[PDB]
Amino acid sequence: VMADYELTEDKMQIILNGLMVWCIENGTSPNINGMWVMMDGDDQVEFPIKPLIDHAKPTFRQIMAHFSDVAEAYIEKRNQDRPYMPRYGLQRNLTDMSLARYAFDFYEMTSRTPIRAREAHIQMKAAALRGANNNLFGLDGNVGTTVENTERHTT
Amino acid sequence: VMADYELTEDKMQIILNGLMVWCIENGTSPNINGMWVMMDGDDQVEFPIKPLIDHAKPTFRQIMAHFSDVAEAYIEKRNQDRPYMPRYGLQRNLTDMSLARYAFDFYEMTSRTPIRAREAHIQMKAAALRGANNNLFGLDGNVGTTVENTERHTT
Amino acid sequence: DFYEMTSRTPIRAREAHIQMKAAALRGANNNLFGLDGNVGTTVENTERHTT
Amino acid sequence: IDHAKPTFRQIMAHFSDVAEAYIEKRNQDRPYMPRYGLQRNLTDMSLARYAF
Amino acid sequence: PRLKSLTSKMRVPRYEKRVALNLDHLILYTPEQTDLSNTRSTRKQFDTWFEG
RNA sequence: UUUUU
RNA sequence: UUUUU
RNA sequence: UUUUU
RNA sequence: UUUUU
RNA sequence: UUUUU
Helix, strand or coil: CHHHHCCCCCCHHHHHHHHHHHHHHCCCCCCCCCCEECCECCECCEECCHHHCCCCCCCCHHHHCCCCHHHHHHHHHHHHHCCCCCHHHHCCCCCCCHHHHHCCCCCCCCCCCCCHHHHHHHHHHHHHCCCCCCCCCCCCCCCCCCCCCCCCECC | CHHHHCCCCCCHHHHHHHHHHHHHHCCCCCCCCCCEECCECCECCEECCHHHCCCCCCCCHHHHCCCCHHHHHHHHHHHHHCCCCCHHHHCCCCCCCHHHHHCCCCCCCCCCCCCHHHHHHHHHHHHHCCCCCCCCCCECCCCCCCCCCCCCCCC | CCCCCCCCCCCHHHHHHHHHHHHHCCCCCCCCCCCCCCCCCCCCCCCCCCC | CCCCCCCCHHHHCCCCHHHHHHHHHHHHHCCCCCHHHHCCCCCCCHHHHHCC | CCCCCCCCCCCCCCCCCCCCCCCCCCCCCCCCHHHHCCCCCCHHHHHHHHHC
16 A cells, blocks of 8 residues: 555555445445545545455455454444444344444454443344355356367368 | 657657556547647647557557556545546446446456455456457458459450 | 235235235246356467468 | 577476465465456456466 | 546556656537548538539 | 457 | 367 | 446 | 355 | 332
8 A cells, every 4th residue: 555655654544544434334346437535524535446445465454454453442432422323233233222332244253241231242144144155157258259260161 | 759749858658658648538549549748737639549559569558558557646635636437337237436447458466465356357347348259350352353364365 | 016014904805916916926037147248259379370 | 588489388388386385385374366357357366376 | 535537547548757748738629520531521622512 | 368339 | 088279 | 335217 | 254235 | 220100
């Protein structure tokens, strides 16, 4: 990224802090297009997508698995002020306003964590999947519906 | 080309930048005639074709395979503004407005790229072909329907 | 026909919204492609007629 | 090519594990995949090991 | 903090090394799509019909 | 490898 | 055994 | 993400 | 392990 | 803790 956006600065600190949020409120997959944006007061200075994705060797979740507790405390605060809930449950119909803590697309389970919420995490994980298959292969390139003739036309 | 159009300039930078576009919006084959053109405001200063084709040793795709990511970001921007889609799918009936990214006539697959769009790329590649054959030879030149007589007429 | 769910909203009506959403759909498929343009049922002959 | 009695694969069958470790390293750095699957549509980034 | 779409470190062709060919002043070029095609004819032809 | 108007 | 561009 | 006449 | 838009 | 029309 440092080669891409040409900062020569640790402002990328602030940038990636931005990327946390659009990463949160919406899905996580290579199958993304459009843009994203954050704000500065009332402004909406936009930003692109792709090279933050085409330039990691494992996937996007496998890199963002770090940024766990920061957004955790984030939602703790701004939920303590007001009844925020994220997107990912509102499509999947959570019930408890308390259990916003783990309505993420991504997380890493650890041995410091409660019992109850695990159930919703895993059930709502797998059941939120369906239908899409491993379905390995697409189709091959060598597509000659016929063989070369290897002859000659003459009068 | 530098011998042809006699610039003594890196304006050919801008020219070839033009050639990107007419190269994009339409097919790529030796079987081309007519002209092409770009604009300057509201003007339509035209330009010819052939010597950009008769003067490369492998084919035209095999040279334009470079210019990949430039037009990629191009369409990213001007699609982000407005619902552009190119030609090549509109003849082949794409469905998703998002997947304009790879409705080209040409591209080089790489190991930084998604899974999904590959399917449409290859399927719509080969199925967009049909009927035209390897069909090597045309016909030969030595066409004497008869043999010389090698005689004489006399009274 | 349309709405955006938010975190200020009740529990009950969500059920009817989503059930009546998806069940009001049926049958219509993703069904990507139509058909292609290059439709030559034959190949050019590339010959000549003479007497 | 014109100077081996059996074919080219039948000689290059030696050089197996060297390029194997090669791709192990330079894949471990970065998400390389070779050509031969990208024409044939592999799926797993892990399974570059045998897209020869 | 703001920036632009196009870049310079991108992988791009090169006549010689220092040269970058797709000159990055092309921010402003988006005429009508159909207006550029071959499926529509040219303005000159459109004139000469209208005059003939 | 070629062959996508 | 050959035949994988 | 799309697909609700 | 992947697959959660 | 929620769930009392």
